[PDB]
Amino acid sequence: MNYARFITAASAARNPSPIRTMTKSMISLAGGLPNPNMFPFKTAVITVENGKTIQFGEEMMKRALQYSPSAGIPELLSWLKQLQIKLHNPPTIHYPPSQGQMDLCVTSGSQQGLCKVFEMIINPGDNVLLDEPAYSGTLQSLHPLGCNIINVASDESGIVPDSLRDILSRWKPEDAKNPQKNTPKFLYTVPNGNNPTGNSLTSERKKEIYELARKYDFLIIEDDPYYFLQFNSGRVPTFLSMDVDGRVIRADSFSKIISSGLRIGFLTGPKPLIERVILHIQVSTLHPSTFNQLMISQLLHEWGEEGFMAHVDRVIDFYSNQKDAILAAADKWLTGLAEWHVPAAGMFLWIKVKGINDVKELIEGVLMLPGNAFYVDSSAPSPYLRASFSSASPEQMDVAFQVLAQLIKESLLVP
Amino acid sequence: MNYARFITAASAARNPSPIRTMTDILSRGPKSMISLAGGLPNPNMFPFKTAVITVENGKTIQFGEEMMKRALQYSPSAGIPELLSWLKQLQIKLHNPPTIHYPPSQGQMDLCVTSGSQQGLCKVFEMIINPGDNVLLDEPAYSGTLQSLHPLGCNIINVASDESGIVPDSLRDILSRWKPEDAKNPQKNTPKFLYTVPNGNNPTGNSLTSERKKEIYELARKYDFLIIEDDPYYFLQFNSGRVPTFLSMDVDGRVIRADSFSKIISSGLRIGFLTGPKPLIERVILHIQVSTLHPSTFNQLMISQLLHEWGEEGFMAHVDRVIDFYSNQKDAILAAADKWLTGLAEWHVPAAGMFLWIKVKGINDVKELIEEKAVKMGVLMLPGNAFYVDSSAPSPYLRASFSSASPEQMDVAFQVLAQLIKESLLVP
Numbered sequence: 001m002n003y004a005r006f007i008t009a010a011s012a013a014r015n016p017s018p019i020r021t022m023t024k025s026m027i028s029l030a031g032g033l034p035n036p037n038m039f040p041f042k043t044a045v046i047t048v049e050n051g052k053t054i055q056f057g058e059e060m061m062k063r064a065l066q067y068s069p070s071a072g073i074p075e076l077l078s079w080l081k082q083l084q085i086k087l088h089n090p091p092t093i094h095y096p097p098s099q100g101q102m103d104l105c106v107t108s109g110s111q112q113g114l115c116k117v118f119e120m121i122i123n124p125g126d127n128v129l130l131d132e133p134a135y136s137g138t139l140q141s142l143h144p145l146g147c148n149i150i151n152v153a154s155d156e157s158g159i160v161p162d163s164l165r166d167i168l169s170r171w172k173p174e175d176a177k178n179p180q181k182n183t184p185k186f187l188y189t190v191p192n193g194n195n196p197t198g199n200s201l202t203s204e205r206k207k208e209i210y211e212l213a214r215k216y217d218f219l220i221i222e223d224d225p226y227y228f229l230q231f232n233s234g235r236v237p238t239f240l241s242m243d244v245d246g247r248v249i250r251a252d253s254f255s256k257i258i259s260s261g262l263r264i265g266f267l268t269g270p271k272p273l274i275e276r277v278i279l280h281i282q283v284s285t286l287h288p289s290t291f292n293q294l295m296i297s298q299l300l301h302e303w304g305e306e307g308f309m310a311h312v313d314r315v316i317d318f319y320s321n322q323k324d325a326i327l328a329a330a331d332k333w334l335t336g337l338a339e340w341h342v343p344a345a346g347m348f349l350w351i352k353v354k355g356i357n358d359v360k361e362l363i364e365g366v367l368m369l370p371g372n373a374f375y376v377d378s379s380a381p382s383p384y385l386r387a388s389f390s391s392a393s394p395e396q397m398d399v400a401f402q403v404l405a406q407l408i409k410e411s412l413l414v415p
Numbered sequence: 416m417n418y419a420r421f422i423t424a425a426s427a428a429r430n431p432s433p434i435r436t437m438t439d440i441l442s443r444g445p446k447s448m449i450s451l452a453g454g455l456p457n458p459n460m461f462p463f464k465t466a467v468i469t470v471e472n473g474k475t476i477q478f479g480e481e482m483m484k485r486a487l488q489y490s491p492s493a494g495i496p497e498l499l500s501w502l503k504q505l506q507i508k509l510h511n512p513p514t515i516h517y518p519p520s521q522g523q524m525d526l527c528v529t530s531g532s533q534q535g536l537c538k539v540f541e542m543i544i545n546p547g548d549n550v551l552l553d554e555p556a557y558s559g560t561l562q563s564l565h566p567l568g569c570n571i572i573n574v575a576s577d578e579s580g581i582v583p584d585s586l587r588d589i590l591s592r593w594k595p596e597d598a599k600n601p602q603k604n605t606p607k608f609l610y611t612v613p614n615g616n617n618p619t620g621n622s623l624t625s626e627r628k629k630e631i632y633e634l635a636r637k638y639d640f641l642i643i644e645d646d647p648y649y650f651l652q653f654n655s656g657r658v659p660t661f662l663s664m665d666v667d668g669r670v671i672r673a674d675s676f677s678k679i680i681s682s683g684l685r686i687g688f689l690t691g692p693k694p695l696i697e698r699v700i701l702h703i704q705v706s707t708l709h710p711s712t713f714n715q716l717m718i719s720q721l722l723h724e725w726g727e728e729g730f731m732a733h734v735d736r737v738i739d740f741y742s743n744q745k746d747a748i749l750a751a752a753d754k755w756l757t758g759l760a761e762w763h764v765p766a767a768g769m770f771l772w773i774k775v776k777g778i779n780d781v782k783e784l785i786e787e788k789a790v791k792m793g794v795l796m797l798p799g800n801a802f803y804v805d806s807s808a809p810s811p812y813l814r815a816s817f818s819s820a821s822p823e824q825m826d827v828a829f830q831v832l833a834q835l836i837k838e839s840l841l842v843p
């Protein structure tokens with residue numbers, strides 16, 4: 001892999017900090033670390049689910065309130081590496097560092113990793129592959145970068161490989177080696193329960209997508225926050241699991257399973273590219289909150305893999321009942337007025353109103369919002385709406401979908 | 416003031432999220448933010464339930480059932496409302512900026528919480544710099560800013576400095592290469608901004624005077640350039656009565672000020688704040704929204720509750736306690752420097768912060784002496800090379816930190832320094 005074609009001139013330029021470096025009877029007058037005996041917070045005790053207790057003693061608190069490495073605290077990084085191995089067993093583990101060895105870093109949410117990755121790759125006028133409708137957060141990130149977003153057709157089983165084949169045919173495999181031909185830099189995808197569709201990719205489709213990424217030499221950006229929210233029996237193999245070449249950048253998030261407000265996520269990918277990301281982070285946020293990482297690592301030490309897997313299962317059990325409750329309310333009132341696909345993962349139900357052309361007109365909420373937001377051209381009319389089942393009660397859903405049905409009936413009465 | 420002549424095309428392009436949010440107030444009792452769409456994860460799934468944090472010189476902080484659910488959930492990009500209002504009021508009592516009641520487009524004073532003051536600085540640099548732009552700075556400077564500016568392909572023009580910081584006549588001599596009218600002509604390429612650490616500059620420990628700041632501001636109007644006031648050691652000034660800040664004298668709305676809690680409350684919590692004109696602060700909030708989304712909700716609530724219970728009085732008492740320690744540390748480092756380094760080096764007394772900047776009298780390059788000979792001997796310090804744009808050039812200076820070493824750790828270490836200096840002077 002020639003990683004040089006995926007790193008910008010600005011990203012390449014980045015150098016490591018001269019004081020990082022530096023970091024047993026040493027006298028340190030090097031590092032400008034503030035004195036922790038001056039910090040006002042002294043000890044902490046956080047209660048868990050249930051009777052379980054996390055404790056930050058005198059010294060643990062001093063560590064928590066102080067600076068820490070850019071990539072994350074060592075104990076968190078080692079625990080996460082082991083999880084990635086048991087879940088995905090990537091081919092890249094023992095590869096030489098320059099050949100794309102598997103590396104990890106803790107980010108201030110999964111959004112930070114995605115952002116630094118997009119900024120490392122995109123030069124104004126570069127072609128990027130994506131599937132509409134997409135997560136508004138990535139569209140909002142890509143827009144200022146002045147790149148060309150080429151939409152790939154999708155259905156109930158996510159990205160359609162033949163659409164990607166048809167698109168890619170505008171270039172020749174040999175063109176990737178020629179810089180001035182301008183072949184796609186990457187393909188971005190949410191493989192499980194895409195925001196806003198709730199649709200998931202299959203094993204066969206992923207295999208086919210990977211085969212095209214080798215052929216036309218482009219990276220795969222696996223944004224998988226709903227990986228631990230798959231409804232059906234046995235999780236689908238990830239792009240990272242089949243990454244023989246070291247062309248996959250995977251983003252994981254604790255936001256849907258542990259806490260969204262703590263701002264803790266992780267990026268997995270080849271060492272050359274992960275390095276560039278750590279060097280940018282080193283000049284932005286310096287590192288993710290020491291306190292917030294120690295909170296998760298102490299919880300993880302208490303739970304272990306079993307305790308963590310048992311917790312994911314309790315979260316899946318909650319979202320599965322919510323999904324069933326939104327589907328029942330949808331069946332009761334929307335039948336004859338709308339069409340929808342059963343969500344494979346996540347927290348969203350994507351509704352297509354049968355008659356109407358623009359649904360933004362109809363709403364004029366709570367759990368619903370219009371399709372417009374999930375497109376590059378948000379000014380175009382959309383008959384779709386996104387309903388969230390993460391918080392509404394089964395009876396809150398019934399009441400709301402009953403209001404939807406009447407509004408739909410009103411618009412259909414007028415020519 | 417045309418703010419647009421300073422920003423990049425990418426910065427302008429940024430839009431707010433289509434998914435609308437806000438703090439409740441109309442419901443239950445405890446206010447927390449809600450999403451008007453909305454895909455907020457269920458907080459009844461989060462494993463952390465309640466929290467109790469002890470405070471030395473304050474009441475014990477407590478996060479109950481509902482407060483914890485708020486803390487573990489998403490929050491606004493600019494910061495939690497209670498922290499933003501408290502910080503705005505502090506900026507008013509400390510700096511009383513002229514820009515407070517100005518129209519928003521005229522550079523009205525605005526604030527935002529960042530994930531450390533480094534994040535604010537970063538987003539600000541990225542907002543302004545286009546490859547080939549001229550920027551004003553004083554060497555030696557904070558390595559973090561140099562490491563930030565280097566990939567941006569901008570031309571760093573060094574301004575001469577002394578014990579009283581930036582020398583206004585050097586800045587006058589530099590600026591003379593253009594005419595005041597040139598700022599209005601895009602193709603003339605006049606400086607976009609001047610970056611400065613006004614109190615206890617990293618690595619010098621030198622501080623700017625009131626008279627010098629006034630003179631610097633007068634030049635920024637004349638040649639129309641912003642002032643980036645990176646002030647983390649503002650609350651670590653060793654002499655009686657703090658010097659007025661650039662923000663305090665900002666009649667035009669040309670000042671972007673960065674503040675940090677790292678040296679006074681906690682560095683590991685990653686909480687800082689940016690103060691400046693609403694048009695430029697918006698651009699910064701909009702970039703943050705696509706990077707980290709917002710600063711940790713938990714970490715903000717912790718500071719907000721401490722600051723609120725303390726009051727400004729409580730806060731000031733704590734900064735006075737902090738300053739007291741570093742001042743004693745500064746005296747110890749100066750004594751150890753007097754004892755061993757006299758005859759071998761020269762230094763200025765630090766006005767603020769945690770660093771002592773030593774110039775070795777004889778030697779030209781302090782690098783192998785500090786990275787090889789000194790580590791072998793068990794003493795850690797930094798060579799001057801790191802604090803320059805051209806880090807490959809030899810440096811006779813070294814930076815010593817007095818933030819943690821004991822008075823006897825200082826004595827032992829400076830005794831090792833003297834022997835190493837004496838060794839190099841023996842060889843021609």
Ligand SMILES: Cc1ncc(COP(=O)(O)O)c(CNc2cc3cc(Oc4ccccc4)ccc3n3c(=O)[nH]nc23)c1O
Pocket residue numbers: 108109110111112135137190195223225252253254255260264265432434436450452453454455489490491492704708709
């Ligand atoms: C596919 C995908 N990739 C990456 C990320 C980033 O995840 P991290 O790992 O960084 O946490 C997400 C998070 N998604 C949403 C966040 C969200 C946040 C909100 O609150 C704020 C607060 C401040 C600024 C903006 C939004 C209000 C509504 C929100 N929302 C929604 O309605 N659908 N999906 C979301 C994602 O879905």
Ligand SMILES: Cc1ncc(COP(=O)(O)O)c(CNc2cc3cc(Oc4ccccc4)ccc3n3c(=O)[nH]nc23)c1O
Pocket residue numbers: 017019020030031032033067068069070282286287530531532533534557559612617645647674675676677682686687
């Ligand atoms: C003038 C000025 N302006 C803004 C900021 C940013 O302040 P905030 O973003 O925290 O508000 C600073 C921070 N200074 C230092 C940080 C520092 C951090 C370290 O720990 C890490 C950890 C991870 C990555 C990099 C460094 C190890 C040594 C460090 N160090 C040193 O030795 N001198 N000054 C520092 C500053 O001096």
